[PDB]
């Protein structure tokens, strides 16, 4: 009965569509972007990547058992970190740049101290307590991290003590992705049950649940302002969710594409939504009109990860063919 | 125009790339196998002569080849997410319990699920039908009937070409090749030539399954080579 009342409020809320509100705006038209660089030296599939805050540096993880940080401008490998386990579904760079984190099927998040005396990378803190594989790790601050897991629970940790300060438990399936808000006070999770939840880190309870997806939502990202997020699914449709309105405004779908979205990312302005597909091509969507503007196809294998640089300069996409390529 | 510090950084990067290439050549030598079996199938006891909550790993080498065996013991019933990672494996060792007739249909459906998976399409399956001794004991007791679980066994005749082992009853042979025929009948229509199945009858107390895995791995690599050299 409560669910019916909740659905009734959403229906009355929507007076107009984002398409019709948007329709009196100039199209972006056609945008073309060419691969400025390609980063060799990965011997196996690239599962995930994350840009640094400075945006010169990025970290990428692979099945080969190596977590290697790059200098993007010069294409030079800054560090090379032997990984104890070849299974790694995620990597994360701290906002300050001192730490880089790694998570995988071994049920542990490993925190690596990049900057230290003796000039080698060592494991500052190994985090344990999750029953399922860690799908995504993201740093709130240097001292605290949040990890999304396949056991249907997201957790917030503190790195010094190594114990879960809070646990987030409202999902019914594996949590595939986690995306932190710009203000850090709240985050949004995407999970295989096809519902996206808005969590609050301080209170440890779900504020909102959005369910406009038929299939699992693989990847999820915040709009830059922080009042909206976008999801990516095996449905081959990307859906733009709004927090304050509490309903989905827009859906991005085309009849040609039928493959799942591996990764979603937003431009700094928020006009362009970049989506990475299993069909070996990343499609640039005008987020406000749901009209395709271009394709970024230079990968033989699937594009596992996509990331937009903090200064907005670049887009770096890692793919299963082990080559990672900036697209300025 | 590169600074002295930038030249030193490039030298560091080249040394790192050299060490990475050395580790990659070390990694290419070993062969990798994914083990996927239900409980009671004795999946842990497939290999015993020679031998981390998410993955339990056992490494065995026979005749100058290194085999890397991966078993996932820290996941729920549904396996579709972590199965995507194991797409580069040389072969899959699928274990099914022949003795437990109630769970055999579940094993058959699991075989359909693994065989028809999109990521595990090109990979071949080395099938091990375990506990043949227990199957023989059950049919010797005779209370259990395979016909009641599957109607087709009630009218079945053993193939003439198949050679029985010494001391093997014809109805024991009938049941064994019946279960094998069901699994291989799933295998046949789905493959299309990209991969194939290697049905093997394995007692619980069997001295060598490493020799069987090695021979089927050689066959997989040989067929990959025959496909790569444009012979087929």
């Amino acid at each position: 009965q409560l669910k019916n009342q909740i659905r009734d409020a959403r229906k009355a809320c929507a007076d107009a569509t984002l398409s019709q509100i948007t329709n009196n705006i100039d199209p972006v038209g056609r945008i073309q972007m060419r691969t400025r660089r390609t980063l060799r030296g990965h011997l196996a599939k690239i599962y995930a990547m994350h840009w640094g805050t400075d945006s010169r540096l990025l970290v990428s993880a692979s099945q080969d058992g190596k977590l290697i940080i790059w200098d993007s401008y010069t294409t030079n490998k800054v560090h090379a970190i032997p990984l104890r386990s070849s299974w790694v579904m995620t990597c994360a760079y701290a906002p300050s740049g001192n730490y880089v984190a790694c998570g995988g099927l071994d049920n542990i998040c490993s925190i690596y101290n990049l900057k230290t005396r003796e000039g080698n990378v060592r494991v500052s803190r190994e985090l344990a307590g999750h029953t399922g594989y860690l799908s995504c790790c993201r740093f709130l601050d240097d001292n605290q991290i949040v990890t999304s897991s396949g056991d249907t629970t997201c957790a917030l940790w503190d790195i010094e003590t190594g114990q879960q300060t809070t646990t987030f438990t409202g999902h019914t399936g594996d949590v595939m992705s986690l995306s932190l808000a710009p203000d850090t006070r709240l985050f949004v999770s995407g999970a295989c049950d096809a519902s996206a939840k808005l969590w609050d880190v301080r209170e440890g309870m779900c504020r909102q649940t959005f369910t406009g997806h038929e299939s699992d939502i693989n990847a999820i990202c915040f709009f830059p302002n922080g009042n909206a997020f976008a999801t990516g699914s095996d449905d081959a449709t990307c859906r733009l969710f709004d927090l304050r309105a509490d309903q989905e405004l827009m859906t991005y779908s085309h009849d040609n594409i039928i493959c799942g979205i591996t990764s979603v990312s937003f431009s700094k302005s928020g006009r362009l939504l970049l989506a990475g597909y299993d069909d070996f091509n990343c499609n640039v969507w005008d987020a406000l009109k749901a009209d395709r503007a271009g394709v970024l196809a230079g990968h033989d294998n699937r594009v596992s990860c996509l990331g937009v640089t903090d200064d907005g300069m670049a887009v770096a996409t890692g793919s299963w063919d082990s080559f990672l390529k900036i697209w300025n | 125009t590169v600074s002295a510090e930038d030249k030193a950084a490039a030298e560091r990067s080249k040394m790192i790339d050299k060490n990475l290439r050395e580790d990659g050549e070390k990694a290419r030598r070993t062969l990798r196998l994914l083990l996927l079996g239900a409980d009671n199938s004795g999946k842990s006891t497939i290999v015993k002569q020679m031998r981390t909550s998410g993955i339990f790993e056992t490494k065995f080498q026979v005749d100058k080849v290194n085999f890397h065996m991966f078993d996932v013991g820290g996941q729920r019933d549904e396996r579709r997410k972590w199965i995507q990672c194991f797409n580069d494996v040389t072969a899959i060792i699928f274990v099914v319990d022949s003795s437990d007739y109630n769970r055999l249909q579940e094993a058959l459906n699991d075989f359909k699920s693994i065989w028809n998976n999109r990521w595990l399409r090109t990979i071949s399956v080395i099938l091990f039908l375990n506990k043949q001794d227990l199957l023989a004991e059950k049919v010797l007791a005779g209370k259990s009937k395979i016909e009641d679980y599957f109607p087709e066994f009630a009218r079945y005749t053993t193939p003439e070409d198949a050679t029985p082992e010494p001391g093997e009853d014809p109805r024991v042979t009938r049941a064994k090749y019946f279960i094998r025929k069901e699994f291989v009948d799933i295998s046949t229509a789905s493959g299309d030539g990209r991969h194939i199945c290697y049905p093997h009858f394995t007692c619980a107390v069997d001295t060598e399954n490493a020799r069987r895995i090695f021979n089927d791995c050689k066959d997989i690599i040989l067929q990959m080579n025959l496909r790569e050299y444009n012979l087929v």
Epitope: N76, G119 | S3, A4, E5, A8, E11
Partner: single-chain antibody, 226 residues
């Protein structure tokens, strides 16, 4: 993290002497190693050996008769000198350096051993007497611009307390060295480089050396004693 050294003593001219630097406490293979000091003069660069010994440079005044080799399993590097002369008396410092994006080379220096027998970097070499609590500014000029096209400016400031090997204060004129108090601050435009200190206090009186790193050979400053 230590860098002990051995060898020295009286040596007749034209002889030979092997100086060894045994590192113990860090990953010796990842650090490119390098410096001497006359009895009454500033620091003078000598040589350099890269990671894996893939690159070597020498000062022109010691070219053709100085050799360096590093025993990575032993965690030690040596300096083989032949045809010594009266002007080679100095105290040799074993200095580490690691080169990547955001690194801090010359961070740690050796103890030093007494042995007895281009970009021109200018320092005023005159420093007002030390006054606690009063700001002090030390300026070092350069012959050519040290700001490379990539945007990094290659200046390093080193402080030598009396009776202690010099310590890195600032790397690239704007980035503070690790473990040093925040009061030190460096700034300046091209060819006009300054080091500013606020809230001066004890345990800071020493000689301030300005070093360049745009290209070899590395030329130090004359030094400004407080």
């Amino acid at each position: 993290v230590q860098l002990v050294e051995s060898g020295g003593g009286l040596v007749q001219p034209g002889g030979s002497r092997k100086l060894s630097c045994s590192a113990s406490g860090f990953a010796f293979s990842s650090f490119g190693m390098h410096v001497r000091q006359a009895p009454e003069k500033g620091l003078e660069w000598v040589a350099y050996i890269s990671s894996g010994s893939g690159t070597i440079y020498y000062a022109d005044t010691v070219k053709g008769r100085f050799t360096i080799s590093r025993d990575d399993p032993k965690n030690t590097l040596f300096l083989q000198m032949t045809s010594l002369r009266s002007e080679d008396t100095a105290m040799y410092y074993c200095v580490r350096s690691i080169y990547y994006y955001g690194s801090s080379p010359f961070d740690f220096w050796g103890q030093g051993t007494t042995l007895t027998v281009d970009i021109v970097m200018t320092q005023a070499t005159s420093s007002v007497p030390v006054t606690p609590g009063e700001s002090v500014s030390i300026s070092c000029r350069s012959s050519k611009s040290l700001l490379h096209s990539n945007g990094n400016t290659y200046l390093y400031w080193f402080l030598q307390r009396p009776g202690q090997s010099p310590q890195l204060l600032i790397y690239r004129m704007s980035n503070l060295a690790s473990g040093v108090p925040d009061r030190f601050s460096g700034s300046g435009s091209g060819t006009a480089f300054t080091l500013t200190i606020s809230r001066l206090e004890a345990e800071d009186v020493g000689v301030y050396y300005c070093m360049q790193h745009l290209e070899y050979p590395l030329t130090f400053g004359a030094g400004t004693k407080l």
